[PDB]
C-alpha cells in the first residue's frame, strides 16, 4: 500500500493520501496483540525506513506556496506513526552486505539518530508556535522510544544531548536515562 | 597621611595586579615605603628599588600579604573594606577577580566590630553590608562565586548572624513582594544558611510566628488589606528557599511549620499560593531524609505515600492551584533578576473551611505516625496551644482559621471552653 | 551504562545549578539513581521524587556532595575530569564559574594515576594535562 502512495507524487491531491495512510499506521500499532504477524519485527523495521523519507522539513517555504502548509501537517502525522512504530521495536539490518551484525546496528542507529536531531534544531522556535512545540514534542518522544530498547548500540552516540542548547530538552533525556539504571 | 593607612594599602594591592610593566614596580615601592612607616608586620622582607621586572601573574604574591596582614592587623579592617568595595566598581572586569581573591580573609574581622559597644562602630559595619549586597545584585555573571566566598564564609560566624539577616529584611522590603532586591535577597539566604542551620532557621521562623501576632492590635477583614501585609509574603519566600535539603530544621521546628501552613493555605496571588505547596512537599521529603530521627521502617512507608497523595489533582484543588501543570514552574521565574514580578488576573478564587479540614488532617496523620518512634514528644502539645490562642481572640481574619483547627487537633475538652465556642456563636 | 558511572555524574552536577525549575528536580532524580545502582558513598542521604522546588541558588550543594565523592571515590577520577572540561567549553559565562568549584577537589587525585605502571593511564593524564593548557590560553577575563 505504501509503495503506491510513495510514488504517487506531491500535489495538494496526492498529500492529503500520504496523511490518512499515516494515520493508519498508527491506528494498526494500537491493535498489533489482536492482529497475526508473520514476522513482526522484520516488518516493523521497513515501515520506518518508508516513512522516515517523507518527514521534510522547511519544504513549506521553499515551495514559496502556504497552500502546501499540509506539509507541516504530513511531518507532524509522520512522526506519530514513527513513535508507534518505534516503541519497543529491536533493530536489525537487511542482510544486502556482508558485514559484521554489530557494526550494523550502530551505523544503523546513528542513520536515525541524525536525522531526528537535524528536525529538532528546525523546530527551535527561533528559528504556529503550537506546531512547533508539538512537533518538537514528538520529535523527541520518538527519540526515546529508540533509544532505550537500543541502549547497547546506541548509547554513545547520544550522550551529547546531555548539554543540548535546548533547556526543555535537556530535562527529558535525564528522565529516560533515570529509568535505564532502575531496570535490571 | 597617618590617618589613612588603611585606604593607601589598598591602592598599593589594587595596582600591583595591573597589566602596565611600569606601574607593578611603582606599586612595589609604595608598599615598602607603608610597612616601614607604620611598622605593619608582614612574613617577608621588601626592599625599595628601581628597575624591577615584576611578572604579570602576580596573584599568589598579593593575596599572601593581604591574608597575612589581615591576621595579625586587624584595627585596619574596617577603613581597608570600606576602600576596598569602592574600588570594585571602578575596576575592569579582570580586575574584578582580584579583588574578591584578597578581599575574603578581612570579612573575618568584623567579629569584633559589629558589638563594638555601640561606638558608632557598629553603625559601620552594617553601612559595609549594605555595600556588599548592592554587587550581588549587579554582578550576574560572577554570581555562582561570590555566593561561595563573601556570604558562604561570612555565614559562618556566629556572633555575626543577628546583624546580617536583619539588612537582607529591611533591603527586600523597599523593593516590595516582586521587586528584584527582595528577590535576590531570598536565593541569598540559602547560601548565608549553610553554615548555621540550626540558627537562620529559627530566626526565620521567629520573625513569621511575631508578625501573624502582631495583627491582633489593627484587626482587617482579611490578611492582604492588612498593613503588615508586605512584610508576611516576603518572609514567605524566605521559608520556601530554605525549606529543601532540611535547611529549616524540621526535626525542632514542625510545630512552628504547620502552624503558619494552615494560616496561609489558598491566599495570596496565584504565585503565593503554589509557593506553599512546595513548602509542604519539602517539609515531608525532609523528615523521610533526616539522620537525627531515628523512623522506624514501618513509620516511613507511612510518610512516602503521603508524598505522593500531595502531588494527586485532588490536593491542587485544595490549595487553590487548579489549572496549573506544575507548581515548580510557577512558583520560581526564571528572569528574576532582570525584571520584577507582574501580577495580574486579580480575579481571585474563594476558600472553603471545609477544604482546611481536609487538609488539617491530612497533616495531623502525618505528625502522628512520627510521635510513634519519637519517644516523649511534644509536637502535638506545642501546635495546640499556638491554635489555642488565636481561636479564643477576636481576629476577623485568622480567628474563623484557628477555630476549624483548633477541634480537628484537640484531644480534651472541658465544659469552660464549649462556653466560650457557644458564646462566640451568640 | 554500568561502565560510565563517572561519564553520567558530571551531567547530574552540571544541571543542578542550571535555571531551568523543571530541569533541576529531574536532575536530581538521576543523581538519587546513580547512588543506589552504584553503591557511591555520600555524606546525607537522597530519596527520588517529583514536585520538588528546588531554589536557584544551589551552588554550596553541589560543591558539598562532589567533595565527597571525589575523598572517598577516587577510581572515577580519570573519566569524570574529562568531562567536565569537556562540558565548561559548552556552558555559559555563569554556569562556567560553576565548574571551576567542585572540579577542583579532584584533581588532588591525579597523584595515583600520573606513575599507574605505564598502563596506559600515564599517557590519559597528560591528555587532561593539556586539555586544562587550552582553558588557560582562551579564558582571560577568568
Not at chain 1, 508473520?38 to 522547511?58: A, H, I, P, S
Not at chain 2, 628601581?50 to 601573574?57: D, F, T, V
Not at chain 2, 474563594?350 to 502522628?368: D, G, K, R
Request: a neutral charge; proline letters at 3%.
Amino acid at each position: 500500500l505504501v509503495r503506491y502512495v510513495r510514488v504517487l507524487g506531491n500535489m495538494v491531491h496526492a498529500i492529503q493520501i500520504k496523511t490518512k495512510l499515516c494515520q493508519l499506521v498508527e491506528v494498526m500499532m494500537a491493535r498489533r496483540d489482536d492482529l497475526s504477524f508473520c514476522q513482526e519485527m522484520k516488518f516493523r523495521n521497513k515501515m520506518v525506513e518508508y516513512l522516515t523519507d517523507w518527514v521534510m522539513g522547511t519544504s513549506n517555504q521553499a515551495a514559496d506556496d502556504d497552500v502546501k502548509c499540509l506539509t507541516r501537517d504530513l511531518d507532524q502525522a509522520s512522526m506519530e506513526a514513527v513513535v508507534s512504530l518505534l516503541a519497543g521495536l529491536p533493530l536489525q539490518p537487511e542482510e544486502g552486505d556482508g558485514v559484521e551484525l554489530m557494526e550494523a546496528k550502530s551505523q544503523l542507529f546513528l542513520k536515525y539518530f541524525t536525522l531526528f536531531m537535524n528536525l529538532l534544531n528546525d523546530c527551535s522556535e527561533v528559528e504556529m508556535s503550537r506546531r512547533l512545540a508539538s512537533l518538537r514534542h514528538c520529535t523527541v518522544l520518538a527519540m526515546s522510544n529508540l533509544l532505550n530498547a537500543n541502549v547497547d548500540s546506541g548509547l554513545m552516540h547520544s550522550i551529547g544531548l546531555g548539554y543540548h542548547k535546548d533547556l526543555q530538552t535537556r530535562a527529558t533525556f535525564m528522565e529516560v536515562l533515570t529509568k535505564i539504571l532502575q531496570q535490571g | 597621611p597617618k590617618d589613612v593607612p588603611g585606604t593607601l594599602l589598598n591602592i598599593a594591592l589594587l595596582n600591583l595586579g595591573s597589566s602596565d610593566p611600569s606601574l607593578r614596580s611603582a606599586a612595589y615601592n609604595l608598599l615598602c615605603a607603608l610597612t616601614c612607616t607604620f611598622n605593619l608586620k608582614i612574613e617577608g622582607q621588601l626592599l625599595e628599588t628601581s628597575g624591577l621586572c615584576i611578572p604579570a601573574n602576580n596573584t599568589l604574591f598579593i593575596v599572601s600579604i593581604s591574608k597575612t596582614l589581615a591576621a595579625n592587623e586587624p584595627h585596619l579592617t574596617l577603613e581597608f573594606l570600606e576602600e576596598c568595595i569602592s574600588g570594585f566598581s571602578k575596576s575592569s572586569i579582570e580586575l574584578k577577580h582580584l579583588c574578591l581573591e584578597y578581599m575574603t580573609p578581612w570579612l573575618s574581622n568584623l567579629v569584633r566590630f559589629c558589638k563594638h559597644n555601640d561606638d558608632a562602630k557598629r553603625q559601620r559595619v552594617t553601612a559595609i553590608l549594605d555595600k556588599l549586597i548592592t554587587m550581588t545584585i549587579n554582578e550576574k555573571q560572577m554570581y555562582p562565586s561570590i555566593q561561595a566566598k563573601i556570604w558562604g564564609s561570612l555565614g559562618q560566624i556566629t556572633d555575626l548572624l543577628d546583624v546580617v539577616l536583619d539588612s537582607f529584611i529591611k533591603t527586600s522590603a523597599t523593593g516590595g513582594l516582586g521587586s528584584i532586591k527582595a528577590e535576590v535577597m531570598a536565593d541569598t539566604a540559602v547560601a548565608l544558611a549553610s553554615g548555621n542551620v540550626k540558627l537562620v532557621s529559627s530566626k526565620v521562623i521567629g520573625r513569621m510566628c511575631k508578625i501573624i501576632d502582631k495583627t491582633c492590635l489593627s484587626p482587617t477583614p482579611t490578611l492582604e488589606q492588612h498593613l503588615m501585609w508586605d512584610d508576611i509574603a516576603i518572609l514567605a519566600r524566605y521559608m520556601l528557599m530554605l525549606s529543601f535539603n532540611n535547611s529549616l530544621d524540621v526535626a525542632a521546628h514542625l510545630p512552628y511549620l504547620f502552624h503558619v501552613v494552615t494560616f496561609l493555605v489558598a491566599t495570596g496571588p496565584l504565585s503565593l499560593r503554589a509557593s506553599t505547596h512546595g513548602l509542604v512537599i519539602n517539609i515531608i521529603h525532609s523528615l523521610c531524609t533526616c539522620s537525627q530521627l531515628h523512623f522506624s521502617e514501618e513509620t516511613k512507608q507511612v510518610l512516602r505515600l503521603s508524598l505522593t497523595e500531595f502531588s494527586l489533582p485532588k490536593f491542587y484543588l485544595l490549595f487553590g492551584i487548579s489549572k496549573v501543570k506544575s507548581a515548580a514552574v510557577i512558583a520560581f521565574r526564571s528572569s528574576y533578576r532582570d525584571r520584577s514580578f507582574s501580577p495580574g488576573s486579580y480575579e481571585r478564587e474563594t476558600f472553603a473551611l471545609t477544604s482546611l479540614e481536609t487538609v488539617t488532617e491530612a497533616l495531623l496523620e502525618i505528625m502522628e505516625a512520627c510521635m510513634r518512634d519519637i519517644p516523649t514528644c511534644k509536637w502535638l502539645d506545642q501546635w495546640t496551644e499556638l491554635a489555642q490562642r488565636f481561636a479564643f481572640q477576636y481576629n476577623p481574619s485568622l480567628q474563623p482559621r484557628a477555630l476549624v483547627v483548633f477541634g480537628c487537633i484537640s484531644k480534651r475538652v472541658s465544659h469552660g471552653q464549649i462556653k466560650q465556642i457557644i458564646r462566640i456563636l451568640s
